[PDB]
Amino acid sequence: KLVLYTLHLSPPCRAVELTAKALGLELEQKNINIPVLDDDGTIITESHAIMIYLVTKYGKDDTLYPKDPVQQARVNAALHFESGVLFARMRFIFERIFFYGKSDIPEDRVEYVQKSYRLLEDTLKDDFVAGSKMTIADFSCISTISSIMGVVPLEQSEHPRIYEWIDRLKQLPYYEEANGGGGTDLGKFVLAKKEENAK
Amino acid sequence: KLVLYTLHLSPPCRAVELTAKALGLELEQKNITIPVLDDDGTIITESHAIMIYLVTKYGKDDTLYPKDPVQQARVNAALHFESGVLFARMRFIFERIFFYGKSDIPEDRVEYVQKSYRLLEDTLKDDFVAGSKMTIADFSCISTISSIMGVVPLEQSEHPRIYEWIDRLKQLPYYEEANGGGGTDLGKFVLAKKEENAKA
C-alpha cells in the first residue's frame, strides 16, 4: 500500500493528497520522524513526479494525465507553470518569514505573486488550467493558490476566472479534506509567524 | 518539419535544442513563454513539455525519457527541480538587472542560487542528474547552470560533481552549438547589463 511522508500544511503534499483521492486511493499519511511517497519500498519524490506516477500506475483511465502526447504536453506545461511560477514565487515570500525570522514581505515579492495571479487568470481560458477537463495540473495549481491567497490577497473583481475555477474545484467532495483546510491554515500560519517574528 | 520559435540566449530554448540534437532531429529556428514548437501544425509550448513530447514522438529508445514509471519519476523530479529551483532563482536575479535597471544582486538572492548549486551537487550521486544515464533532465539543468554560473560564481573545489557532470556534457558533439555558446553569452550579457546600469 501507499505511505506518504508529509505535512498537511505543505502545498505539494496536498497536491498529492488531491491526486490520491481522485484516483480512489487510500493514503497512510506519516509525519517526518516532502512529499515522499513509499509505494511498497519504492521511494518516489517531488509532488509532480509523484502525481504522474500515481496516475500512471493506478489510473483506470487517463483523464487526470493523458497518454496522448499533445494533450499530455498541455498538462506538463501547466505542471511546470506551477513549479516554475506559482510555487516558486510563494516560496520566495514564505521562506524569508519561516526560516529567517523576518517580519516584512518586500513589495517586489508581493508584486511577483500578483503577477503570477494574472498569468494564471490568462491560462484559464477553459474551465481548468490545461483545458476543458480537470487534470493533476489543477491539483498542483490549487494546492498553491489556496495557500498564497490567504497572504497576498487575490481580488475577486480582477480575477473572475480564478474564482470560478476555485468554485469548480470546491465542488469535489474531497477538496476540503485533501487540500482546502491545509491551504487556509498555511496562510494563517504564515501571517501568525510574520507577526510572531516581530515580537 | 520541426519549427521552433526561439531565442538562442534563452535557457529553456537551449534545453530543447540539446534535446533535438540528441534525438538526431533537425530544427528550423525562427526568432520571436518561448520556446514554441510547431510540429506540422501541432503546437507545443514550454520547454519541459516540448522535450518530453519530442522524445515520446521521435525517440528510437527510451534513454532520454524512460518508460519505467520509477526511472521516469526520477527524471520528472529533476525537471521540476530545474523549473522550480534552478531556473526560478536565476530569473529572480536576471529580471532585476534586465528590466529594473539594477546593478546590484541582493545578497540573499546570491545565496539562494548558491543553495541551488548545493542541491544540484547533492543530486549528482551518479553521473547525471537523474541517475547513471543521461536524460532530458540533464539538458534542462545544464541550459540554466551554464548561464547562471557566469554570474553567480560556482566554485570548483566545493562542487566537484557539478564540474565533472559539465565536462561529461561538453563531450557531446552538439553541446557547444545547441547550448554552450548561448549559455555563456547570456551570462556575459547579464554582467555587461549590470555594469552599464550603474553608469549614471
Numbering used by the authors:
A (entry chain C): 3 to 35, 55 to 220
B (entry chain A): 3 to 34, 54 to 221
The authors write:
Using genome-wide transcriptional and functional analyses combined with structural and population genetics studies, we conclusively demonstrated that a single amino acid change in the binding pocket of the glutathione-s-transferase epsilon 2 (GSTe2) gene, coupled with increased transcription, confers a high level of DDT resistance and also cross-resistance to pyrethroids in the major African malaria vector An. funestus. The topology of GSTe2 indicates that the 221 amino acids of the An. funestus GSTe2 (afGSTe2) are divided into two distinct domains similar to that of An. gambiae (92% similarity between the two species, with a difference of 20 amino acids). The active site is located in a deep cleft formed at the interface of the two domains, specifically by the interaction of H1 and H3 from the N-terminal domain and H4, H6 and H8 from the C-terminal domain. The active site of GSTe2 can be divided into two sub-sites.
To identify the structural changes responsible for the higher activity in the resistant GSTe2 Benin allele (119 F), its X-ray three-dimensional structure was determined and analyzed in comparison with that of a L119-GSTe2 susceptible allele cloned from Uganda (UG-GSTe2). Overall, the structure of BN-GSTe2 and UG-GSTe2 are very similar. However, significant local differences can be observed between the alleles at the C-terminal ends of H4 (containing the L119F mutation; residues from 113 to 128) and H8 (residues from 213 to 220). These differences can be described as a concerted movement of the BN-GSTe2 H4 and H8 helices with respect to those of UG-GSTe2, which opens the active site cleft. Leu119 normally forms part of the solvent-inaccessible hydrophobic core that stabilizes the conformation of helices H4, H5 and H8 of Uganda-GSTe2. However, to accommodate the bulkier Phe119 side chain in the Benin-GSTe2 structure, the N-terminal end of H4 has a dramatic bend, which increases the size of the H-site in comparison to the UG allele, where the cavity is tighter. The H-site surface representation of both proteins with a bound GSH confirms that the resistant BN allele has a larger putative DDT cavity than the susceptible UG allele. An assessment of the DDT dehydrochlorinase activity of the recombinant 119 F resistant enzyme (Benin) and that of susceptible L119 revealed that the 119 F allele is 3.4 times more efficient at metabolizing DDT (82.9% DDT depletion after 1 hr reaction in the presence of the cofactor glutathione (GSH); P < 0.001) than the L119 allele (24.4% depletion). This is confirmed by their respective kinetic parameters, with the 119 F allele having a higher catalytic efficiency (kcat/Km ratio) for DDT (316.3 μM−1.s−1 vs 92.0 μM−1.s−1). Overall, these structural analyses demonstrate that the L119F mutation is the causative mutation that confers DDT resistance.
